[PDB]
Amino acid sequence: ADTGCAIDISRQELRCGSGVFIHNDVEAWMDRYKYYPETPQGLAKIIQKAHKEGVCGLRSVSRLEHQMWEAVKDELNTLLKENGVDLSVVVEKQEGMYKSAPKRLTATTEAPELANNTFVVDGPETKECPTQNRAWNSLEVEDFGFGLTSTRMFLKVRESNTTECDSKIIGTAVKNNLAIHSDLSYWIESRLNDTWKLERAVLGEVKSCTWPETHTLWGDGILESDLIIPVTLAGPRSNHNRRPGYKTQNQGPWDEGRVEIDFDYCPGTTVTLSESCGHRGPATRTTTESGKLITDWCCRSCTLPPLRYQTDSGCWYGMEIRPQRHDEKTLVQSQVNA
Amino acid sequence: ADTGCAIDISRQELRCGSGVFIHNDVEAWMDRYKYYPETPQGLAKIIQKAHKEGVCGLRSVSRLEHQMWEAVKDELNTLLKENGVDLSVVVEKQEGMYKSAPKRLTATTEAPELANNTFVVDGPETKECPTQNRAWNSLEVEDFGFGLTSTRMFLKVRESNTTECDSKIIGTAVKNNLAIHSDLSYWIESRLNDTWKLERAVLGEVKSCTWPETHTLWGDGILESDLIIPVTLAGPRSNHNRRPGYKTQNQGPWDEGRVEIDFDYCPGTTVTLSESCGHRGPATRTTTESGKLITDWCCRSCTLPPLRYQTDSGCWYGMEIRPQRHDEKTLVQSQVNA
Ligand SMILES: *[C@@H]1O[C@H](CO)[C@@H](O)[C@H](O)[C@H]1NC(C)=O
Ligand SMILES: *[C@@H]1O[C@H](CO)[C@@H](O)[C@H](O)[C@H]1NC(C)=O
Structure with a gap:
């Protein structure tokens, strides 16, 4: 077993002893x-x-x-x-x-x-x-x-x-209302605000192995449809792997290599709720192939702050996020279906 | 989040950084x-x-x-x-x-x-x-x-x-093939030998709160019948809370206060497989009220080493474990049904 010492701000204490330590090696x-x-x-x-x-x-x-x-x-x-x-x-x-x-x-x-x-x-x-x-x-x-x-x-x-x-x-753990599923390439971070939900995800790369039930918190009562990170892309079968107003992101920018997921606004962009907006489709990038910035996005039933991808090429919104003004062919869209 | 350093024998390494530390505070x-x-x-x-x-x-x-x-x-x-x-x-x-x-x-x-x-x-x-x-x-x-x-x-x-x-x-965590469900009073340890199964449990006291699914590993596909520590006594709805050849221990010595669960032989006792043995019943102590020792126990379909309780009053075997020779009234048996 693990023996050591750590500073827990949450419990405002410094403690030493035997136990289990999960590290962030993806950062x-x-x-x-x-x-x-x-x-x-x-x-x-x-x-x-x-x-x-x-x-x-x-x-x-x-x-x-x-x-x-x-x-x-x-x-x-x-x-x-x-x-x-x-x-x-x-x-x-x-x-x-x-x-x-x-x-x-x-x-x-x-x-x-x-x-x-x-x-x-x-x-x-x-x-x-x-x-x-x-x-x-x-x-x-x-x-x-x-x-x-x-x-x-x-x-x-x-x-x-x-x-x-x-x-x-x-390495998988939960303490002080922080829940983590991690390996050498994946760091998935969910927090307890008002509720428990996904907050942060960092993928050195995206891989197609499957995540073990043995190392999965909250594995009961699973809807695969609600799993943000798809199962086929090593998404854990957890009710931690969810966010209100979002579904499986089968069409996220997975083939970009490094994928950083969080809930915020893509720099210089706006997402707004509208029934006039369109239904979910392939994750779109804010910058087009030319590089033009797209200010106005929309969504129907997603929550805010909105699902955000960060990628070497630029930043992307979630599938439920759609452009307020655009025709569809003109923009960069994920072509991944998993 | 937690920041610190620890020595992991399993990975034969010393590492420092941010993450999550689960401590053994029950010991x-x-x-x-x-x-x-x-x-x-x-x-x-x-x-x-x-x-x-x-x-x-x-x-x-x-x-x-x-x-x-x-x-x-x-x-x-x-x-x-x-x-x-x-x-x-x-x-x-x-x-x-x-x-x-x-x-x-x-x-x-x-x-x-x-x-x-x-x-x-x-x-x-x-x-x-x-x-x-x-x-x-x-x-x-x-x-x-x-x-x-x-x-x-x-x-x-x-x-x-x-x-x-x-x-x-x-605090609940799994790393280097060690799985732990814990709080200030409960330390539940399951390890990966040939398979994953319960190995060690230490309870400062026994409590009737319920264990959160959110903090429960391997919570899928649950048979409540197979959960060693019962749900009603803050038993985690985990497939980690199981051992081959055993079921729910509803009649364990829970009213003794501190209960230490593990798989070994009660000092000076023998457990053996036999079809002639009796069916599961209330957890029995090795020492009787007089203090007399009971050498020969049996079980039908349990595994070995056998389920063992340690308590201030003495040590007890699991429900599937029965005395080879005794009449039933004569011995100390748990009167707990949960
Ligand atoms: C590859 O096969 C040819 C047979 O035509 C042979 O001449 C050559 O030496 C072989 N190369 C190696 C590296 O074995
Ligand atoms: C208890 O009630 C009686 C009423 O007969 C009263 O005289 C006494 O002061 C009470 N004691 C306290 C501690 O309130």
Whole structure:
């Protein structure tokens, strides 16, 4: 268990002792955790067997998994060639959300040149290596290793087949009327004002694993329709994952990569209730492709402050938020349906 | 939010930053928290109005509530008499579980001698002040006050009528495969071995408030029948509140006061699986009223290590656990049905 000390402003006290500590590692720019294959030689053999099985490539679950592949790929290919394996691993850059894949790597056993055959990691959708023949979520943390600068997390091949996110790195807690669902890439923050509802969400990236019921507060009496963050995008089945006047945001800007969700106004914009406004549709950005600002938005039955996305490209409103004045084709809209 | 540093053996790392810390305050003998009425003068007027409305007395929710009454009672009665009110508060000692009561104190306004009329706090069941005419769970934490030695918790009268435990003091969390539901009196520990299941529970006292769904992990797909700690005794509606081969322990030794639940063998006893054994019945103690030890127990479909209670009087086995050799009347059995 965890032993330590902390300053709780809410209870206006400083306390020390055993218990459980949930940290915010999504805000920290530094990667305080790092992934490492348990064995490089074994992993090499896994892929050729994966290749043998007819697997063209792989899709990482998260940026950190993606990053892991980036560092090891040289070492893998060198082995692959010194072993004499024809295959060579290609790690393709991933921008946007990390999608899932039906195939899974199988557990077995108990500088670099170009090469003839490729194992493709991530990147865009290709007909060369369609996702239907790619692996995903095939690894899990066996244990941790002490790191001076960064905690080491040793991965291993999953024996079971799941869509569930790795439980180990998940931290979930509620105290002093603050409720948190978190992992290394997700920080979902809900608070008790007048009521309990979603307030803040930060996603280093968007991923398509599923969130465990075991690590889910308020999992009873669930309407999937009311879940802001969709289940298929690793949204937790919680009644914490809700806000009055909003539904599932299946058409949010998920393919933008980093997504910051909160309830406020997009800079220089206005949202207002109106029955003359239009019904929910794809999340729209305030700035258009030209960059023009859109001042007047509306919504029918949403609450205020309004659902807000922040993205490298700009900021977006929720699906229920619609432009007061615009024709629809002219603006940037999320093309994600999940 | 909480800010601090802690040593996580599981992840073999030391980390510092913002987040959420759940402390084990049920193990600490010292009362790092203390209850205080927001206003003694107001509280006095509350009771006489309660008395006026026909409220004979009160039942505390927890030992800490009970303790609050103990310290304040002199000061109350002094006021009550210096005010000239006929009523005086009698705080009766509470041993065993803290039961609920239908009446609630109403919020309003915006050394000591004996006396003629009494307002009774806790104690045994009386026909003089039946529980049906007593108050319970009428107060809640408004805010905290910094204390050097002990954190101050200021109470206030609840406007809504609930059976729910006070959310403020609740800490619930799961990390590194340790799941905890806790408050100032309850420490419920479930761990991930082969599976997720209950492992440890420590109750300073037993209370009849209800555990909030909002602060409950794994609250989906609930069979109330399988919940080890019953709902009616602030048992969390969690699939963490379960163990294979066991059901609701409605007839556990709850009226003993402090109850420590775990899975092991009661000192000098043996539990074994047998179809010849008997069906579930009232939790029985290993030592009889004489003190005689009972070596041989059995169970039908329970798992091992067996469900174990530890109590000041002695140790007890779970309901599914039965004596191998005994006649039933001869032994100490819980007389609690909840
Ligand atoms: C790829 O295959 C060709 C066969 O035509 C062979 O000449 C070449 O050496 C191979 N490359 C590697 C890196 O094995
Ligand atoms: C109790 O009532 C009697 C009435 O006969 C009165 O004399 C006495 O002063 C009362 N005591 C208090 C403490 O009010």
